[PDB]
Every structure is written in C-alpha cells, then in structure tokens.
Amino acid sequence: MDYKFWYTQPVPKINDEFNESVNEPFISDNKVEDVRKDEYKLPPGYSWYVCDVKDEKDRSEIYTLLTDNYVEDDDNIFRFNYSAEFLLWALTSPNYLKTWHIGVKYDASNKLIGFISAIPTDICIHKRTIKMAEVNFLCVHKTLRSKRLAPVLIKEITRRINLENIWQAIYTAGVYLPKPVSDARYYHRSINVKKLIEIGFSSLNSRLTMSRAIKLYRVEDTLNIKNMRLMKKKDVEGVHKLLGSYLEQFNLYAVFTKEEIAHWFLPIENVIYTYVNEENGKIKDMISFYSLPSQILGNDKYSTLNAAYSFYNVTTTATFKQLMQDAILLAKRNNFDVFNALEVMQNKSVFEDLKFGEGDGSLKYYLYNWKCASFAPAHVGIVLL
C-alpha cells in the first residue's frame, strides 16, 4: 500500500535502512518563527476543542470517546478501556501543555468525536538526548473512519509541538507505518486461568483439562525478595539513581528527571504500582506495572479483563527471573487477571520459564523526524502507555 500521507512527512521510506553511524533529524535547522500560526482546517461542522484533562467533565468526555472507539484486538473481542484517572496521570506529567491535548467536536451535538495528545519528554536515541513529544491516544469515532481525519489531527499536533521549538516525536502503534526503529512482540502470563478460558482468551485441550490448566499457572504467595514494598515519596531519589543508571545501556530510553520519577512511579490505585527493595536506605531493586483493563465485547458473564502491563523492572540483589516472578505475584495480589509484557529490555529471557504465552502481533516503535539504524527490541529501553 501507498502511504500517501506518511510519505509527505519527515520519516523513512519503507525501503530506507541506515548505518549505525547515522543518527540525526531528516530536517535540521527548523525555525519556530516559520511555523504556521493557523489551525489546520477541519471539514464543515467540526471544530477544534482544547480539552482540560484536569477538569472532571472534560476528562470524562475523553474517557467516553476512548471507551467506545479506541484500539481493539484483531478479532474485535477486546477494546482497551484506559480509566479516567489513568488518563489524568498519563497527560499531566512534568511540563505538560494543555494545548497538546486536542479534541475535535461535531458542532451540532457538541460531542467529542476525535482526540490526539502529546507530552514532552527527553529521549535518548543511540546516545544523543533530544527533547521530544510522546504522542498517544489518537482516536477518531468509529462512525467517521477512513475520512482522512487522522492526518489532520497529526498535522495539527505537529504544528503545536513545533511552536515549542520541538521537532522530534516518539510513538508506538500495532499497525505497520513508515518506518519502525524497533518491533516488539507482546507476551502474556495467565493469572486467572479460568476467567481467561471462559472469555476465549486462553484455551484447553484433551491433555490440558481445566483443573490441569489451573494447576499449571498456580503461584506461591511468597515473594522472592521479602522486603519488596509499595514505593513512597522517600524513595524517589533511590529510584532515580537505580533506574537512571540501568537505562543507560539501551539504544532508546527516556532520560528521567527526579520530578518525572515521582510522577511516573509513585503509586496510584488502579493506575500505577511501583514496589521497591530498600537496603541500608538504598533502593536496590524495583518492580513496576500499570493497569490497563480491556472491555470484553459480547461475553455474557464478564465485561472487564483487568490486566497489568510490565513497566520498568531492575534487580541488583536477585536474578531478573526472580524479580519478574515477584512482579507476577504482586499483580496477582492486586486482583489482575493477566500480566502483559513486551520483549524489550531483558524481558524475553524470562518468558519461557515464567510461563508467558506469545501473543498475536507486535508493537512497533517509531520516531518522527529522526533517521537512525533500527535495532532488535532487546535494545529498546522505554515502555509507552
């Protein structure tokens, strides 16, 4: 297929491949003064709207649009159902701009029918740190698909981002676009085996009976690392040092400030869970994962699959396998049905032994206006939401 929109943008062509030593923008020497000051045109009867995510009622409208129209699995059995409070956390990180939270309304109903967002973050790509926008929650209402609205959303946020003298973005999608810098399969570890069977997610066979399936996935309710505990404000500096050091080995990662650590890690029920092991007042090991339920479409008995998504995990006192086994246990202890991760960082190495199953597709990582060698997902050190 043709990429008639993407090919007009500063991203690689589908055939482009770059040496390791290439690491630079497609278009350099950009000037804020030259950026269009006019909003991009929407079709007749539709308007831009600046969402205030801190306002319960605006935040709810975004919640509704995503609950009804956001990403579905290939088989349209499941639809991501990010919670309102999770969207608050995801969009109000350090230095967020309200004007990067862009909705589109249909004038006559006053209804939100589109959305796109970005937050600022410093991104280290092949050892060069660059200020970028992380883009997420692009969504057009199901009733308005394939009408070329999405490039309008993209072009408008790009314009707003450029106004802040920012010229690169990072983003992820399951769809293949020009052109990933990396590609990571997702893996899933069953926690509530029976529920996962009943909604079709997992399956049985003549050898794996229901009772045998339950037994296979049984976990012991005892932590390998005894003192692993919810993170507290006191733990911010330790976490910053532990994580910040660990992340330097990767080809792609966020450079977190102390302020970004407190925001991205301090726990929030039903949103973010971070656990630490403190020894001698030092943080030596951490586990984290975020909550991302999916709505279950057309199952008579269950309407929600609660799922925990591996975020950042670092051990210096245990094996990485022992640490992730603890991450599974803490997710079970918090009522999650399943523990999801990507084959990024060291993850892949523990998936077989910990009984993860390979999923159906993969998550592509993309950069905007950035030219560089692609790499295997083990070299990816950032997890987007």
Ligand SMILES: CCCCCCCCCCCCCC(=O)CSCCNC(=O)CCNC(=O)[C@H](O)C(C)(C)COP(=O)(O)OP(=O)(O)OC[C@H]1O[C@@H](n2cnc3c(N)ncnc32)[C@H](O)[C@@H]1OP(=O)(O)O
């Ligand atoms: C320096 C700053 C730079 C800032 C910007 C950085 C870039 C940020 C990029 C965004 C990052 C988002 C990351 C993110 O949020 C995580 S990926 C999740 C995206 N959201 C969903 O999948 C929700 C369900 N689907 C929808 O809502 C609609 O299908 C959407 C809105 C996806 C498209 O609506 P539509 O009604 O289906 O489509 P048209 O309007 O007709 O438009 C079609 C054009 O859209 C291209 N398309 C489709 N899906 C895309 C996707 N996921 N990324 C980028 N492009 C995507 C497509 O290839 C085509 O271009 P082409 O003709 O060249 O092929």
Ligand SMILES: Cc1c(C(=O)CCc2ccccc2)oc2cccc(OC3CCNCC3)c12
């Ligand atoms: C997208 C995804 C999946 C999936 O299985 C994608 C298919 C799906 C879509 C909607 C509802 C349920 C399933 O598994 C993951 C396991 C780990 C991380 C993942 O990606 C995250 C980062 C980008 N946004 C979604 C979560 C994923």
Ligand SMILES: [Cl-]
């Ligand atoms: Cl244009």
Ligand SMILES: [Mg+2]
């Ligand atoms: Mg459209």
